Subunit: 137 residues, 4 copies
């Protein structure tokens, strides 16, 4: 089969966000290995600058290990952790994709140019994401 | 060595932000060559975004220093992208922040907080700090 | 004395937000009767219609429940909170987000504007019964 | 000489300087209350902003920002409810949705102004 490695970059600050990341992960598991930052032992609010540093390095690793970075763009604004991770993964030449069901945008003209142009594709639904993934490989 | 290469990652969406960024540039233009995205119709959207994007990537590759202005209701997603991109290609990443606001009561998101070598709250200290690093 | 009328002021911009609102409403439908704005032609006329619909629905409400979660507190939620407080409804917040405005918590207009802010649907419904009897 | 309440974010010195640019701009037409100039610490902050909002004729809410500020929006709503003339000032090219501002904001503001020259001129008629 070959199971590509996927890193889900996504806000994880309330249970709706965390339940929604699980949904995306369960939808991809028959395709791809999925790293989920919220399930990777280290979560902040549960040692301040050492927890921060531990979270940071664990995320950098997981990004380096992945083939794909899926960035969840939903929210009143695009989360800054997600944007940073999107730019880092682009610069080390990962395949970069966006997931966006939200009606809100940065400006009437859509997402920021650095988000819109770094994602090869931005998807509004999981099925299109899954078919696009299978044709890419 | 020459004058160091500062790229200014900053929100530029109203006239306050644009003036704020000109103020930052004018104070550094003794230390560093400064790239301001806002200064450096009949345009189809997709090729517009591409050219703005490509030029910023190219400027970022050509910088020694990325300075990320972290102020605002949210940290700008353009700024946060540029920080991650610059950090992955091993630039010097600094933050500038004057807002009282944060993501959570624990501070900035750890990716922003741990990727900036330092975050400054006043230009004088930032400028002097760069001066010590490069003599 | 019948069932109290409750207005759910919440962001409704994606299916996760819309589902989460439905879950708040379902949890409360034994206590109270819940107006759900997501459950209730040019755009200049569509705005004032939603506006008037919502305004009228807050005026006929007893309780305003404002969910504060998000990268920012939604501006509509914030508008509805202040509009409901000025006409003397009971104003309550619901907040599961670990995020705040400052490292000192919510904006004080929000913090003192709400009479209490809950993190469980459990504790909130208990407060209301022990309030009304 | 109406009394005017500036609903404005005030969390960095760019925002605060920008506020005083608005208020100094209009101090020939109207009196302006600036919240940045004028447990229990938050309660006092609360009690004073509402009583100042009460004494105002006009609420002008600056909408610029990556979000419309919740404090500003709270006061916009409060001010509309007790029947002030509510207006907006928006220079930011950002919007909530690609269809403009939230309908609670757009329709509670009688007019949304792009520059102070227009705002200045509109209050001449009122």
């Amino acid at each position: 089969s070959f199971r590509p490695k996927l890193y889900l970059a996504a806000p994880l600050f309330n249970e709706a966000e965390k339940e929604s990341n699980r949904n995306i992960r369960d939808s991809l598991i028959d395709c791809c290995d999925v790293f989920l930052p919220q399930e990777d032992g280290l979560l902040l609010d549960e040692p301040l600058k050492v927890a921060e540093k531990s979270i940071y390095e664990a995320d950098i690793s997981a990004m380096k290990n992945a083939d794909i970075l899926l960035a969840v763009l939903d929210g009143a604004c695009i989360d800054d952790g997600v944007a940073f991770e999107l730019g880092y993964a682009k610069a080390i030449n990962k395949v970069c994709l966006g997931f966006q069901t939200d009606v809100r945008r940065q400006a009437p003209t859509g997402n920021n140019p650095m988000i819109e142009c770094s994602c090869e594709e931005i998807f509004s639904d999981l099925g299109s994401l899954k078919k696009w993934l299978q044709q890419k490989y």
